[PDB]
Design a protein around this nucleic acid. Structure first.
Ligand SMILES: [Mg+2]
Ligand SMILES: [Mg+2]
Ligand SMILES: [Mg+2]
Ligand SMILES: [Mg+2]
Ligand SMILES: [Mg+2]
Ligand SMILES: [Mg+2]
Ligand SMILES: [Mg+2]
Ligand SMILES: [Mg+2]
Ligand SMILES: [Mg+2]
Ligand SMILES: [Mg+2]
Ligand SMILES: [Mg+2]
Ligand SMILES: [Mg+2]
Ligand SMILES: [Mg+2]
Ligand SMILES: [Mg+2]
Ligand SMILES: [Mg+2]
Ligand SMILES: [Mg+2]
Ligand SMILES: [Mg+2]
Ligand SMILES: [Mg+2]
Ligand SMILES: [Mg+2]
Ligand SMILES: [Mg+2]
Ligand SMILES: [Mg+2]
Ligand SMILES: [Mg+2]
Ligand SMILES: [Mg+2]
Ligand SMILES: [Mg+2]
Ligand SMILES: [Mg+2]
Ligand SMILES: [Mg+2]
Ligand SMILES: [Mg+2]
Ligand SMILES: [Mg+2]
Ligand SMILES: [Mg+2]
Ligand SMILES: [Mg+2]
Ligand SMILES: [Mg+2]
Ligand SMILES: [Mg+2]
Ligand SMILES: [Mg+2]
Ligand SMILES: [Mg+2]
Ligand SMILES: [Mg+2]
Ligand SMILES: [Mg+2]
Ligand SMILES: [Mg+2]
Ligand SMILES: [Mg+2]
Ligand SMILES: [Mg+2]
Ligand SMILES: [Mg+2]
Ligand SMILES: [Mg+2]
Ligand SMILES: [Mg+2]
Ligand SMILES: [Zn+2]
Lengths: 60, 98, 127, 24, 116, 155, 78
RNA sequence: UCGCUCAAACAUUAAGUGGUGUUGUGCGACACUUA
RNA sequence: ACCCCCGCCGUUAGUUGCCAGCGGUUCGGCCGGGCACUCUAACGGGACUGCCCGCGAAAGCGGGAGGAAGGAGGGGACGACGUCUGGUCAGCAUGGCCCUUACGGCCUGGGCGACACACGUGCUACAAUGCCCACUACAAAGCGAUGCCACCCGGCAACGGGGAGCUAAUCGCAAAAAGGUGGGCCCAGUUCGGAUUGGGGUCUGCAACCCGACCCCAUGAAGCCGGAAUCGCUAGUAAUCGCGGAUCAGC
């Protein structure tokens, strides 16, 4: 159940305690940052590409 | 009297647009306090590299959100038209209030 | 007239406003022997004054902020040095060899990832 | 005791306040 | 003095002496002192005869304590026992009532480690 | 390290008497990085020194650490596949290190309640010629002369 | 804990009200082990599910403040 | 408090075998190997 | 090596800060005023074996001065041709095989939380360099519109209610803790230790039996720094003490 779940994640038919976070890009079930709305994986992928504005390689 | 906020990401583009306003306001009106850099609010995001299990070698980024402040005193009519027309922003979301 | 110098260590800054007089030392209000209580490093910060042979002859006034309690003391130590050396070129020829003019690069380093404390790694195992 | 459910640092470690710990 | 019927916390802090009393601890110890104006520092070895019956009878008749308290504790368990709630069956086999890590430790109720 | 000898850490001289040996003692006392706490704890015993005997804490400290300074010790070493307990002189630094160290431990061995009184009484028996730390010194020197046979491998 | 208005299902009270409305049997296969037992519901038999089947667990005075799940095993050998 | 035999559990091994090492039962005062 | 942080200082800007210099003092940088100085970030210089002594053919090493800092100054980013037929078809994409009124779809309840046992990684202790408690002081970084909560009242309290400010260097989370002065404690399974269990409450959520966190009263367990074995770490490191976020209804 991968496809039927990504659709159900956007449904929110019953109570709000089912509208769990869900990555947008690859539709991951966990590790979904709320700010980006993406999973940790696709997040890094884009960041290397430069498609993430203001997101620079951290070094300190 | 008037106060302008110049939020944005790239400080190179923030410096060009902030310096532009300082020349346009002073060279055509009353006094204007130069660019006042504020504490850059940064979003440091840490995370793991590999897709599966690798609680190490992880990689992390940071969202540089800059801040620059510029105050113009006397409401010059030349400065209002100058900034309304001669402007070249881009990724710099500015917000101005009295 | 006055002797000024900048103090700093572990992000604990300390302005040093010194004025020749008695020995009354105020730092961010309060007295020196008052603010620092039960700390031997206190009398150590006044080391620059004992090196110049003028302990009780100067009213100090320092603005030390940020950092820890002791980091301030080290900020005062270097601050007083820059203060008395400001109006004294010859007192640098005997304050420097005694080691005083240094920001003390010694500072806490970043806690590395994968580790626990920038160096200490979790207990290795194989069982 | 950083584990006492009724002490000064007892709540300081648990990130709470309560009675024994001063609260507004 | 024989305070709680049989218990005799002599020769020590008056407040701590009450802690030894079953059903009485650190909190109920200070409470008896602020309701009878007793100094926690003074010992039981040197107190007034009036303060004896005073503090003693007070806490004694006030709240539940001693074996009769313990009887109620087991009484409730007889109730969790007569039917068999999930809480009771943990007392049956000796398991914890929190459903904690039984796959690992929890030796406090399970007794010593029966390697076997 | 295999390359350099790695130079000693030149510590800060005493901030009350003017002597590196005293500060070094504070460090051994220093639990969880509380120098100012241990410093006082040390000066506390210094005053207990003048209380008992009209003697300066300075020389009472020197005499103590001196009489607990191990002259020789046995070190293990391999030879073809066997361990010999070879005795030989210690380095000046190591003697000072062990001396200061044992003393601290000998204080912990004492039944004395307060730490300062433990270091106080211990500093007396040490400067004297008989104490918990001193007896641990006499003990190590015995091992040296005992195995004096294997002293042929001075290396 | 639900101190403001004791939690429980409507169909529970509804099905059990008609049981008191004329004093019927007690058979009632439920699926809400999350609910609190009703006081006057003594003498009935709620067939509480538990993943496996319906447990004919009776009821009485003492068993009231607790849940329906309290008196229904969810694991084998317990 | 020590000496000893035996049967588990754990530790050394990359792993096994064996052994070695501690605690448990009853009494007397490293080496070898790995289709 | 060029990239960033902390290292010396200045250049640019002044709602961060200054009884410092003066007037009111409610004796609080609260008002006036100012930016030199602290700070907030941005640009640039600086250290290069450059100087002297000694060894040396060269490269280079050792010692001394000036300097904030010497021989990469400390840390990070950065981890080659490849190996481990390493890992991942449950992040995703994907060749082929297999299911297709069910290996697909929906809900409710249960289950990853089971316990006679074993191992790894951790928190907190087995206490008088200390435990319980009253007062006082010094951080960095971060986050905050369906969220952070200053002030007033109820109670033992969690918590609730009234209600001001905030697109956030100037409003909130916030007392940093340890530490400084003072008190009881007196070597005791202890004012150490809070695990376990009884009863009564609060918070979020359709729903805290299974299976949440958090108060309060009580019960006050194992537990005297630990065998064979074994781990971390070379300096602002170890050890030790508090703080923040992500994740997130709450945990
Ligand atoms: Mg996609
Ligand atoms: Mg020096
Ligand atoms: Mg550190
Ligand atoms: Mg730092
Ligand atoms: Mg850092
Ligand atoms: Mg501790
Ligand atoms: Mg918090
Ligand atoms: Mg209140
Ligand atoms: Mg009942
Ligand atoms: Mg044996
Ligand atoms: Mg047997
Ligand atoms: Mg036999
Ligand atoms: Mg014998
Ligand atoms: Mg053999
Ligand atoms: Mg064979
Ligand atoms: Mg300027
Ligand atoms: Mg300036
Ligand atoms: Mg050259
Ligand atoms: Mg040249
Ligand atoms: Mg020459
Ligand atoms: Mg050359
Ligand atoms: Mg040359
Ligand atoms: Mg030098
Ligand atoms: Mg020079
Ligand atoms: Mg070099
Ligand atoms: Mg590289
Ligand atoms: Mg496939
Ligand atoms: Mg396809
Ligand atoms: Mg079929
Ligand atoms: Mg503060
Ligand atoms: Mg920062
Ligand atoms: Mg948060
Ligand atoms: Mg509030
Ligand atoms: Mg605002
Ligand atoms: Mg605050
Ligand atoms: Mg103290
Ligand atoms: Mg106790
Ligand atoms: Mg307790
Ligand atoms: Mg519950
Ligand atoms: Mg030890
Ligand atoms: Mg043994
Ligand atoms: Mg939240
Ligand atoms: Zn994703």
């Amino acid at each position: 159940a991968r496809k039927a779940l990504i659709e159900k994640a956007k449904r929110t038919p019953k109570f709000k305690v089912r509208a769990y976070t869900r990555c947008v890009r690859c539709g991951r079930a966990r590790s979904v940052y709320r700010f980006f709305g993406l999973c940790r994986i696709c997040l890094r992928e884009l960041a290397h590409k430069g498609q993430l504005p203001g997101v620079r390689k951290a070094s300190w | 009297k008037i106060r302008i906020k110049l939020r944005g990401f790239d400080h190179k583009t923030l410096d060009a647009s902030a310096q532009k306003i300082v020349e346009a306001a002073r060279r055509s009106g009353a006094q204007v306090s130069g660019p006042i850099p504020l504490p850059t609010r940064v979003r440091r995001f840490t995370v793991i590299r590999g897709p599966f299990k690798h609680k190490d070698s992880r990689e992390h980024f940071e969202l540089r959100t800059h801040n620059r402040l510029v105050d113009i005193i006397n409401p010059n009519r030349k400065t209002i038209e100058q900034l309304m027309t001669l402007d070249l922003p881009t990724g710099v979301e500015i917000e101005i209030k009295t | 007239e006055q002797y000024y110098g900048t103090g700093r260590r572990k992000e604990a800054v300390a302005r040093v406003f010194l004025r020749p007089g008695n020995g009354k030392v105020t730092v961010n209000g309060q007295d020196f022997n008052e603010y620092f209580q039960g700390l031997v490093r206190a009398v150590a910060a006044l080391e620059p004054l004992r090196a110049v042979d003028a302990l009780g002859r100067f009213d100090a006034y320092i603005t030390v902020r940020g950092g820890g309690k002791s980091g301030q003391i080290d900020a005062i130590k270097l601050g007083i040095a820059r203060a008395l050396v400001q109006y004294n070129p010859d007192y640098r020829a005997k304050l420097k060899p005694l080691g005083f003019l240094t920001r003390d690069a010694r500072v806490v380093e970043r806690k590395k990832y994968g580790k626990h404390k920038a160096r200490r790694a979790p207990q290795y195992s194989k069982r | 005791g950083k584990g006492d459910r009724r002490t000064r640092r007892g709540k300081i470690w648990r990130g709470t306040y309560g009675k024994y710990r001063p609260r507004k | 003095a024989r305070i709680a019927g049989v218990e005799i916390p002599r020769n020590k802090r008056v407040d701590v002496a009450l802690t030894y009393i079953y059903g009485i601890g650190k909190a109920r110890a200070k409470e008896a002192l602020e309701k009878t104006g007793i100094n926690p520092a003074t010992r039981v070895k040197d107190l007034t005869e009036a303060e004896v019956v005073r503090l003693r009878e007070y806490v004694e008749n006030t709240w539940k304590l001693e074996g009769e308290l313990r009887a109620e504790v087991a009484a409730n368990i007889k109730r969790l026992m007569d039917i068999g709630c999930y809480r009771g069956l943990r007392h049956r086999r000796g398991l914890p009532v929190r459903g904690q890590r039984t796959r690992t430790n929890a030796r406090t109720r399970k007794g010593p480690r029966k390697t076997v | 390290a295999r390359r350099r000898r790695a130079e000693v850490r030149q510590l800060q001289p005493d901030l009350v008497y003017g002597d590196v040996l005293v500060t070094a003692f504070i460090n051994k006392i220093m639990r969880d990085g509380k120098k100012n706490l241990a410093a006082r704890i040390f000066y506390d015993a210094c005053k207990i020194i003048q209380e008992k005997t009209g003697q300066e804490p300075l020389k009472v400290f020197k005499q103590a650490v001196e009489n607990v300074k191990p002259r020789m010790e046995v070190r293990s070493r391999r030879v073809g596949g066997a361990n010999y307990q070879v005795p030989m002189e210690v380095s000046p630094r190591r003697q000072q290190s062990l001396a200061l160290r044992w003393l601290v431990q000998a204080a912990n061995q004492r039944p004395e309640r307060r730490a300062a009184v433990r270091i106080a009484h211990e500093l007396m028996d040490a400067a004297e010629g008989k104490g918990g730390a001193v007896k641990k010194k006499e003990d190590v020197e015995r091992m040296a002369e005992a195995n004096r046979a294997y002293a042929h491998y001075r290396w | 804990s639900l101190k403001k208005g004791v939690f429980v299902d409507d169909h529970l009270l509804e099905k059990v009200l008609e049981l008191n409305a004329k004093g019927e049997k007690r058979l009632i296969k439920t699926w809400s082990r999350r609910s609190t037992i009703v006081p006057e519901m003594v003498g009935h038999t709620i067939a509480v599910y538990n993943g496996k089947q319906h447990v004919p667990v009776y009821i009485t005075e003492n068993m009231v403040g607790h849940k329906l799940g309290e008196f229904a095993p969810t694991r084998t050998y317990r």
